[PDB]
């Protein structure tokens, strides 16, 4: 289908719609495609899963249902007319679609049109109700009765097919069809009057049945075996978890870039048992307030640096003006987008992408000059006092940018030279 990355890149109108839905994606799009000059093919090539998500969101439809059983008219009846319900009715009933397609633009307007549609006899007939001859309905829609009957016969013709043999009751009734005994009672014959004409409950059963087979064929759209279904697994072997076990072998290698004796540890054990059974002194443990003073010096030396870190243990409040702040933010964001595309370039490992790497490297050099002139402008417009803040804030991304430049230069000298 239209599910390949090529087709997702091809659906430019869908790209247009999702771009128009988003906002920061638009801003990124002008800055890259329109301002910097990024081709949209590799703009969206980094967004293929998001394009797929949008395509799935747009390209889905609901399951069918009976609009007529669900919807009740509730004296002009009030209607909560929904266009989704209207199209539900339309592709539920092509007879209704055909009655719509020649009435609204040619004969009469839309509100009078659906007023006649609610008024009509076919409304309550195709609805969950036997049609009454007392009802006046809509005489215009009464011309569609025999057309819908033709549709009924045609749909019956296309639905009718040879029946699976074991299921088929016609084989049972035709097993001995020459039996001449006695017919059953009035109970077993369908509900008819004294004139023999039926109530039509078999007819409405046929209609609701045919609704079920339209559901079956809606499932059965574009979008031997008897042995297995007659086989019984009740007295058979249960399914076995064939899952593989895992065993471990453990040998940790030691790190890559004096010994006391048993006599020594025995005699020190003897000495320490002697001291233990000898004496324990309470107040000998108090330090001399100079070695304790150096302990305090070391402790406060730790405390000063650690609490200075702990002084700085939505984002943080900034002294930048909002215009310069957002300009730095968006330049940082688009330069990150460049560098991610550069990792796409470099980790591709193809000679095919060489000119792409070259032209992008030119774009990154332009980004470097943009950053330098940006810092120069903030310097000369602010006296560097907050341009230092700007440069320090944008420092790590340009550091990784310089990392990318050095990698490109070194690998170019390695391969070319």
């Amino acid at each position: 289908d239209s599910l390949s990355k090529e087709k997702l890149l091809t659906n430019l109108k869908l790209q247009q719609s999702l771009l128009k839905g988003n906002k920061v994606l638009m801003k990124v799009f002008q800055e890259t495609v329109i301002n910097a000059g990024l081709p949209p093919s590799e703009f969206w090539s980094t967004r293929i899963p998001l394009l797929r998500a949008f395509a799935l969101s747009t390209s889905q439809k609901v399951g069918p249902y009976n609009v007529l059983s669900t919807i009740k008219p509730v004296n002009k009846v009030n209607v909560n007319l929904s266009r989704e319900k209207i199209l539900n009715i339309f592709e539920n009933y092509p007879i209704v679609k055909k009655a719509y397609t020649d009435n609204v633009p040619k004969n009469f307007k839309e509100p009078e049109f659906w007023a006649r549609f609610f008024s009509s006899k076919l409304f309550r007939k195709l609805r969950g109700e036997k049609i009454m001859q007392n009802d006046r309905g809509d005489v215009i829609i009464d011309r569609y009765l025999t057309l819908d009957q033709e549709f009924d016969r045609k749909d019956d013709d296309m639905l009718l097919h040879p029946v699976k043999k074991i299921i088929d009751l016609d084989g049972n009734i035709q097993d001995d069809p020459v039996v001449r005994g006695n017919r059953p009672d009035f109970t077993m014959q369908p509900g008819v009057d004294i004139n023999g004409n039926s109530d039509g409950t078999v007819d409405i059963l046929k209609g609701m049945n045919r609704l079920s087979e339209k559901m079956i064929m809606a499932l059965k759209n574009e979008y031997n075996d008897e042995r297995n279904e007659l086989k019984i697994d009740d007295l058979n072997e249960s399914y076995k978890t064939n899952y593989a076990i895992i065993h471990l072998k453990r040998n940790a290698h030691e790190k890559t870039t004096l010994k006391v004796s048993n006599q020594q540890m025995l005699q020190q054990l003897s000495l320490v048992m002697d001291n233990l059974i000898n004496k324990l002194d309470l107040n000998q443990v108090v330090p001399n307030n100079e070695v304790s003073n150096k302990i305090n010096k070391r402790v406060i030396t730790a405390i000063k640096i650690n609490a200075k870190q702990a002084k700085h243990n939505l984002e943080v409040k900034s002294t930048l003006p909002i215009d310069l702040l957002e300009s730095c933010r968006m330049l940082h964001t688009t330069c990150c987008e460049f560098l991610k595309h550069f990792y796409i370039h470099f980790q591709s490992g193809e000679q095919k992408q060489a000119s792409t790497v070259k032209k992008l490297y030119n774009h990154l050099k332009d980004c470097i000059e943009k950053l330098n002139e940006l810092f120069q402008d903030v310097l000369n417009g602010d006296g560097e006092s907050m341009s230092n803040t700007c440069t320090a804030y944008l420092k790590p991304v340009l550091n990784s940018i310089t990392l990318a430049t050095h990698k490109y230069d070194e690998y170019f000298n390695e391969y070319n030279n």
Partner: peptide, 21 residues
Amino acid sequence: EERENEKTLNDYYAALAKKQA
């Protein structure tokens, strides 16, 4: 507002311009 529409329809004909060329 409307200012996004003239951007993305100019790009619509810009993509068609490279499509024919």
